[PDB]
Ligand binder design. Sequence first.
Ligand SMILES: CC(C)(COP(=O)(O)OP(=O)(O)OC[C@H]1O[C@@H](n2cnc3c(N)ncnc32)[C@@H](O)[C@H]1OP(=O)(O)O)[C@@H](O)C(=O)NCCC(=O)NCCS
Length: 307
Amino acid sequence: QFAFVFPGQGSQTVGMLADMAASYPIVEETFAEASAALGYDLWALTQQGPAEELNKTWQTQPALLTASVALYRVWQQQGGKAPAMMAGHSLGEYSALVCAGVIDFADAVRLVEMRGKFMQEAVPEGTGAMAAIIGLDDASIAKACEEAAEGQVVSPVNFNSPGQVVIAGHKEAVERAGAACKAAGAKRALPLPVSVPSHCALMKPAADKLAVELAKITFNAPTVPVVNNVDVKCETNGDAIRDALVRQLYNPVQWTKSVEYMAAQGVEHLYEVGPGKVLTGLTKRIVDTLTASALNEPSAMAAALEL
Ligand SMILES: CC(C)(COP(=O)(O)OP(=O)(O)OC[C@H]1O[C@@H](n2cnc3c(N)ncnc32)[C@@H](O)[C@H]1OP(=O)(O)O)[C@@H](O)C(=O)NCCC(=O)NCCS
């Protein structure tokens, strides 16, 4: 019936979960647990920022992971039933995996911080770019991307829904490519304010590195199925999960097919377990019978729990 789905970069705000925190002590206990693993106050980070800082990826990832795990902990605390299916967008997949009980929360926390770092350090800032292409079909974008590439690297990285695709690579090629896409009938190429071209070829070297760290973290069997970004496959072999984390890094995030798979899968509703409404917003664009809501405020937490 329902799945939990988990956001990643983009969903951060300074202030996030404040309200939940006031009604649920475990939100802060939770940030405390992670703060003690990062060696700084992560709650204070999210609450006070600044943004500039909270938006740097090696802190964002840990903050979002933490929000999500916190909100999940609330669900269970209140005798929330376990979802049938989870998915997590980009960094989201890590949260999924924690709540599915595959990676322990504190390993995850250090993990996604290291990830951040490998990521940031694989491309020098102002080197790369991401853009959101509103309103073209997938293949005209591939094509756009291919002709704009001109020796550099650009390609679609986020298949978010039909008529929303993110692309990324060398700043210039992104430029060429957005233009192309506009040529080709797109409503919008809207430039995205991110350093890091996640999920294209340029993250390869980060991911090599990420494999090494992963290889030290124990990966247990999922208690719930987790549809992964990279294959839209529900792996159980931790070694296979690990392998998919690694390729997530340099391969497109298949969100659209993933939400589809879970409709195809039985699921009638999707709760966004983390700050923001982004996965919520996309859902009906993918399957408009499907319904979506965020579990990141208390009325809504309460409201969902009553069913
Ligand atoms: C970019 C963003 C914020 C857009 O979501 P929303 O703002 O909720 O979209 P809305 O503004 O509600 O949708 C309407 C507008 O978007 C456009 N649009 C959005 N999805 C569309 C789709 N699938 N097909 C065609 N047009 C679409 C238009 O419909 C436009 O209408 P108007 O010109 O009349 O405003 C969201 O998709 C997002 O956060 N994406 C980031 C995903 C990602 O890669 N994150 C990593 C870090 S950036």
